[PDB]
Design a protein around this nucleic acid. Structure first.
Ligand code: SAH
Lengths: 72, 61, 235, 25, 118
RNA sequence: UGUCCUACGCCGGCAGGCGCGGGUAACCCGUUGAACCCCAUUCGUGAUGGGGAUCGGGGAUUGCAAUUAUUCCCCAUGAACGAGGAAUUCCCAGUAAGUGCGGGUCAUAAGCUUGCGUUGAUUAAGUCCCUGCCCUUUGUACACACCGCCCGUCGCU
């Protein structure tokens, strides 16, 4: 049905990102938004936060596709 | 049981619109059985074919 | 190209084809537009609720048009995906799953009429070795003629691909005892050309002599206005 | 011959048909 | 599956023509779907309904509280027609089977449409 | 491409004004600074920042004249449209398709016909089933044709 993806993090799902997303073996704006049910604007805005905090390795930067990975 | 066959020579194209070609095949397990089959698409000599049932010989005019 | 080239109806109208059939703007328009013409084509009396057969109902678009006009109906279809979409649309009539080539499973003399919108031509092709187009068409119309009440009408919309399918449907239709005809709306147009089987249960003598002499090669007087004319009354 | 006529009616004719379709300096 | 439907259903098997009616019913779930009441409909379906099959099918459906005879009228017996409107067009068999007498072929209902295929 | 193509300077936010030059043209426009394309940003499945129709108000230009909006620009309105039951077109390699750029008509339109380059493939190297055309044999099947039935019943003048 219609998607009501959140535009800002609530308290429950923000914790769910910071202890589960850096262990998926693949982190992408589009695969985060399918499972955490958030907009893609924040789905990429949450990942540059995690990149600056050093929780994720960058694989490719492109205007069309961004690909991320676990640390170890 | 699945069976593999190698073609020997292409007899000619059959079907009303020529959508198939008729080719004589020979097997891989024992080079004695030579049955006649119909295939669609581009076929040349030496091609290896996967036959689902290697019992009946195909036929068309 | 045409949907019948894809294969059997139970596999072509799968789950993903059922969804895009529902949200198809052309389909919602023309399926009800033909069902309006097809319900009007069986000359059933007004202000009287009848019990109708929706053979090949599919999504139930033609089924909903009967219910909005105050009728009751049952639908028979072969693919479960189009039947699942019919349930989700909250339709009124009953739904039956089965192949119309194997027979319509009702008692004789049941329905006041039968409605058909683009389901018939799926029987002119047989995609199994056990299936035969002639026997599946005859098993349809013979069972239809039993189940339809006497004097009623069955109107069938169909999409033939050539002249031979119109013939091969018709001879199987008339061999089961039906009488009627073919109604073609706009018979020489392209987009609006719809086919509807309506079926219901009960001086000059001188000229040729001159030309015969011309064949014989003898000399003749030239053909003019005064060739055969009575000169004057004879006393 | 009968066997020639049967085998001609069992196999497919093929062969001749020429379809005409379609740098140094 | 309406009670009016199977009471007009038959068997399409080649051997059983045409004495396969009626078919036995079973149910493990029954839902009620409201249908608009038209007195003109049911009044002309009483001559067409076969009542002997309706009793045993309600006996299959465990319910006894039915009219025992032909309730024909000039649309004046609203108390009888609404109850059978609840019976015929409103009791739905969500899940169950059909039994053919002369073949024994299963016809299972799956939510809520029977299948009559080979 | 042209004596109508335009360069450059100034003014206005844009359409558009004022001035001064080059080129009858492998000489100027023009190293023809084209569009898709490429790299970053925002958007996040929502008839939505997709889609632009239809409208309201104003400004500018060509024309004797712009009303039924010649044309262009700015702000505002945001319709259907969610890949098209079914009739049918064109196509075998720098081809189809995506993308822009130029001549004949033309006081001014854009809209027809023609070309040009750019990015660039899936399928096929066959057949006479459908359509059309051209040959050979034949007038033996069907139809035409012949023979027959030629719908019956009673009722009065
Ligand atoms: N052999 C067959 N027996 C019964 N139904 C058949 C059938 N072959 C095809 N159908 C049905 O015919 C339907 C055509 S879809 C058209 C249904 C209807 N006009 C509507 O739009 O709602 C399909 O649902 C398919 O299931």
């Amino acid at each position: 049905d219609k998607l009501n993806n959140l535009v800002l993090f609530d308290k429950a799902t923000y914790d769910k990102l910071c202890k589960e997303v850096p262990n998926y073996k693949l982190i992408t704006p589009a695969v985060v938004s399918e499972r955490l049910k958030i907009r893609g604007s924040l789905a990429r805005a949450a990942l540059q936060e995690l990149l600056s905090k050093g929780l994720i390795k960058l694989v490719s930067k492109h205007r069309a596709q961004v690909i991320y990975t676990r640390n170890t | 049981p699945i069976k593999l066959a190698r073609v020997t020579k292409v007899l000619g194209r059959t079907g009303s619109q020529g959508q198939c070609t008729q080719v004589r095949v020979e097997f891989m397990d024992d080079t004695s059985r030579s049955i006649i089959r119909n295939v669609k698409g581009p076929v040349r000599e030496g091609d290896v074919l996967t036959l689902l049932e290697s019992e009946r010989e195909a036929r068309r005019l | 190209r045409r949907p019948e080239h894809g294969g059997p109806p139970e596999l072509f109208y799968d789950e993903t084809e059922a969804r895009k059939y529902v949200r198809n703007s052309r389909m919602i328009d023309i399926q009800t537009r033909m069902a309006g013409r097809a319900l009007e084509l069986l000359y059933l009396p007004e202000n009287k609720p009848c019990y109708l057969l929706d053979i090949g109902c599919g999504t139930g678009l033609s089924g909903s048009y009967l219910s909005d006009e105050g009728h009751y109906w049952v639908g028979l279809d072969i693919s479960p995906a189009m039947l699942d979409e019919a349930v989700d649309r909250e339709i009124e009539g009953d739904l039956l799953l089965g192949d119309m080539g194997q027979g319509i499973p009702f008692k004789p003399g049941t329905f006041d009429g039968c409605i058909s919108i683009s389901a018939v031509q799926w029987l002119c092709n047989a995609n199994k070795k056990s299936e035969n187009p002639a026997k599946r068409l005859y098993c349809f119309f013979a069972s239809l003629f039993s189940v339809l009440v006497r004097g009623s009408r069955a109107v069938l919309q169909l999409y033939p691909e050539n002249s031979e399918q119109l013939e091969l449907i018709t001879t199987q239709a008339t061999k089961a005892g039906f009488s009627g005809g073919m109604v073609v709306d706009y018979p020489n147009s392209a987009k609006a050309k719809k086919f509807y089987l309506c079926l219901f249960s009960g001086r000059a003598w001188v000229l040729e002599k001159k030309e015969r002499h011309r064949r014989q090669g003898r000399e003749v007087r030239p053909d003019t206005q005064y060739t055969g004319r009575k000169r004057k009354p004879r006393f | 011959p009968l066997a020639d006529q049967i085998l001609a009616g069992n196999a497919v004719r093929a062969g001749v048909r020429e379809k005409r379709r379609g740098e140094e300096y | 599956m309406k009670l009016l439907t199977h009471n007009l259903l038959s068997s399409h098997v080649r051997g059983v023509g045409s004495r396969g009616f009626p078919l036995r019913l079973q149910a493990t779930e029954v839902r009620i779907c409201p249908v608009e009441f038209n007195p003109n409909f049911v009044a002309r379906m009483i001559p067409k309904v076969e009542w002997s099959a309706f009793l045993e099918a309600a006996d299959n459906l465990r319910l006894i509280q039915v009219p025992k005879g032909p309730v024909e009228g000039y649309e004046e017996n609203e108390e009888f027609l609404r109850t059978m409107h609840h019976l015929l067009l409103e009791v739905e068999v969500i899940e169950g089977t059909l039994q053919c007498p002369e073949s024994g072929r299963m016809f299972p209902i799956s939510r809520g449409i029977p299948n009559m295929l080979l």
